[model samples]
Target: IGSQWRDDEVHFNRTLDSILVPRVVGSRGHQQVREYLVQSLNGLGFQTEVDEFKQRVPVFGELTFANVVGTINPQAQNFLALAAHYDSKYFPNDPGFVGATDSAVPAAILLNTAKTLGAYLQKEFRNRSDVGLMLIFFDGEEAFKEWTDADSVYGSKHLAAKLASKRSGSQAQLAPRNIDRIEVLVLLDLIGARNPKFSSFYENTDGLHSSLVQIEKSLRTAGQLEGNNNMFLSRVSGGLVDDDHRPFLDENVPVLHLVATPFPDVWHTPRDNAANLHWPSIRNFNRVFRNFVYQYLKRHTSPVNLR
Candidate 1:
């Protein structure tokens, strides 16, 4: 595997350069990533749609932004939202920092998960009206020139606002029942390192933290957990990050933020690319995620709930 494998340096150099070459947010690369994600989701048999919204995004300069949404069971009413940012940042003079572990890897993992779940659902649960998967590839997540509240997580904020609005309206109703059902939100980031550790954000909602603990316990039970090899669950007492999950959390959505804080030294740097990623780490993260989803599906009684 090592022989067939390319070093992180080489991987980083190529992947980062290719993605970073073009400015990220509001640039050609951002559109390309969106198209790529939609194509992949469609190929996997997902019912994909783009949630386009007009926002005053500073980087994109007040252009139309979109969140790529792929749903497996649109009518099911209950949903488990999985998401990752598909946007990169722009830094003049510096090599455009291609975000690999920052997000590209997480996007790939979500795509792969969609494939797995799509196949399984098609074969065994096609007629089931309880479970559903909502995959969101958010745009405008990266800051244009500097990181700030208004400059980041534009897509998620919009989506959350829309969802909240819909839920509030008397006309809105869930399928298989009249109650609204949104189980939980899972956000993945920096999960592509060779020995990446998942340090759960401490400041997230209690329900979100509990869900993450459930996932970790499931991984441990499956013998998939390795000391310091899986996630190093921690608390980010400082406060909430301006990540995609913030919008959902604000709307009272329970969210599991799978992120590595104090991001590796290379983060947002030209060196953060595929080469710096460890395939094993990626695979292990995927395994844990897979198990967590499976366990949730098995344990949850109702796919959609009013609460």
Candidate 2:
């Protein structure tokens, strides 16, 4: 398995280099990143779907957006939905504001996590119809004018509504609905910076968060983790900051938001570029997340033979 695996850091850098641009809504960079995501997921033999939407903003009359969703086992009834916003904050003054930690690294982490876990899902859990992986690259997460309830999370809101409709639509009553199948939405944001401390926010997903803490601690103990700085702590009861998970959380979906507390220093600034990203933190985060999801899926099923 190790020999078959590609270097996640290399792929991470590739994703960042491609997507680390001013990916504000309707921008060329935004569409390019979306296309790259679709292509990457397609390469991994995952079912890719684009949830396209159009919304009228305060200043901007109408804008287009898309949520790029990738699924490993599309037939699965339950999912561990990993998500990050692909759109950057629209800084009218700073055209080169590439939000490396604001979300570029989170996006890369999801892509590379998919890459890291692709083989296991395909071989061991391909036909299993239980819990599977789903990656969502949300658009319109950033506010166009100001951070208001209606101004942000447009993509998530739209997708959540669409999925809810699918659940209530005129389908077989015996069949499982799409919205009900999502076990939890794990969101990552403001990562890839130095010394990020994550705490358990929601009580519903505290056990899952503890599992993540255990994974990080175990990896560090085994010397597989890169940095000495502890990322996940035993801390809890942190208040939620608004992001892409709001809509899903409102719909009774359990949420594990992994965004760093006390937002990164370079957040929403022109300095939030590639130069500010800490490689060790980024690599360690990738390793922890990749292993966490892999183990989560592995725990609920019987082991499969390699050959």
- What TM-score does each of the candidates earn? 0.79, 0.93
- The whole-model lDDT of each prediction reads 0.65, 0.83
Q: For residues 117-139, write the lDDT of model 2, one tens digit per residue.
A: 77887688786876778889999
Top candidate, metric TM-score: 2
RMSD of each: 5.6, 4.1
Off by over 4 Å in 1: 1-23, 167-180, 202-228, 232-239, 303-307
> lDDT at 83 for candidate 2?
92
Tell me the tens digit of each residue's lDDT in model 1 across 1-307.
1112112333333333343334365667777777767777787778999988776755446767888988877887588778888776677765456777778877777776655454464555546767777888887787776778777788888877767764434454432221125677778876666665554554434555555556666656755545454454544434445689887777667667777665666787878775687765665566556655655664656543323
Q: Give lDDT for model 1.
A: 0.65
Provide the clashing-pair count of each candidate structure.
Answer: 7, 0
